[PDB]
């Protein structure tokens, strides 16, 4: 029963139109708890979940300070990648970052992240051992080189194995009621005729937490993947997820097919038959 904390940062340049907008969001497993936006009136880290509001006012001052510092670094990081890649002064570019950690059911350190992507492709990344970096290309190698000399991994190793896991532990403790909960999927089945020759059999999973789900069709107890339409897990908007798997079935063959749901709120995988 693992748990994770992640921070997703984006810095999108807009040349001639002021400084780049920086957004940052924090997530504890599939729930968002924080937000910061450089293009916002407040200019502060703001809560996005009930349980983070129980943090003292000093938290909000320190968090605002830390996110503000990174935003500044990322605007110069955008200007450096631009000269590194011999790219024109014209044109919008994106620098994204992901950092955070993974913990055990007991709270032990499992894994730690700290990585960037420039214009949607990997730039630099801290390796699993947290001592070394992966440089995607040549520009990133210049950074690899700069960061090795500057003991950046050493510092992030301490953040990742220390601050991160501890901070996660208290978010899990404070956010017990909503995070440690497991919402089972409410299943149902729909049937829509394509023609008098065939029909679509849709099978839904609604209101579930976390987003890890598995939906699989079977024709006569043998796994189907030939004519299966499987949409991406989508948020319902209330902090729960939705998913469905459709299948093309000839008229009358509907009783040969079964939908199979695997969720960590389900003791045994639910089987679904029409009707």
């Amino acid at each position: 029963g693992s748990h994770s904390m992640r921070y997703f940062s984006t810095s999108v340049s807009r040349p001639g139109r002021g400084e780049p907008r920086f957004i940052a969001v924090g997530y504890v497993d599939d729930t968002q708890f924080v937000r910061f936006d450089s293009d916002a009136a407040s200019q502060r880290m703001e809560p996005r979940a009930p349980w983070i509001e129980q943090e003292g006012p000093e938290y909000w001052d320190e968090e605002t300070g830390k996110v503000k510092a990174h935003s500044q670094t990322d605007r110069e990081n955008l200007r450096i990648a631009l000269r590194y890649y011999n790219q024109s002064e014209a044109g919008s570019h994106t620098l994204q970052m992901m950092f955070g950690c993974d913990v055990g059911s007991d709270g032990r350190f499992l894994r730690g992240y700290h990585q960037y992507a420039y214009d949607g492709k990997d730039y630099i990344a801290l390796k699993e051992d947290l001592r070394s970096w992966t440089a995607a290309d040549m520009a990133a190698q210049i950074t690899k080189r700069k960061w090795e000399a500057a003991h950046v991994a050493e510092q992030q190793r301490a953040y990742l194995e220390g601050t991160c896991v501890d901070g996660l532990r208290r978010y899990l403790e404070n956010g017990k009621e909503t995070l440690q909960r497991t919402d089972p999927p409410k299943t149902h089945m729909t049937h829509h005729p394509i023609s008098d020759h065939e029909a679509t059999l849709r099978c839904w999973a609604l209101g579930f937490y976390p987003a890890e789900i598995t939906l699989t069709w079977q024709r006569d107890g043998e796994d189907q993947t030939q004519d299966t339409e499987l949409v991406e897990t989508r948020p319902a908007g209330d902090g729960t997820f939705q998913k469905w798997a459709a299948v093309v079935v000839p008229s009358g063959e509907e009783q040969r097919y079964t939908c199979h749901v695997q969720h960590e709120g389900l003791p045994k995988p639910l089987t679904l038959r029409w009707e």
Binding site: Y7, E63, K66, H70, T73, A139, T163, C164, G167
Partner: peptide, 10 residues
């Protein structure tokens, strides 16, 4: 908990 400043650029 956001990471403390890394005062090292690209």
């Amino acid at each position: 908990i956001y990471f403390s400043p890394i005062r090292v650029t690209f």
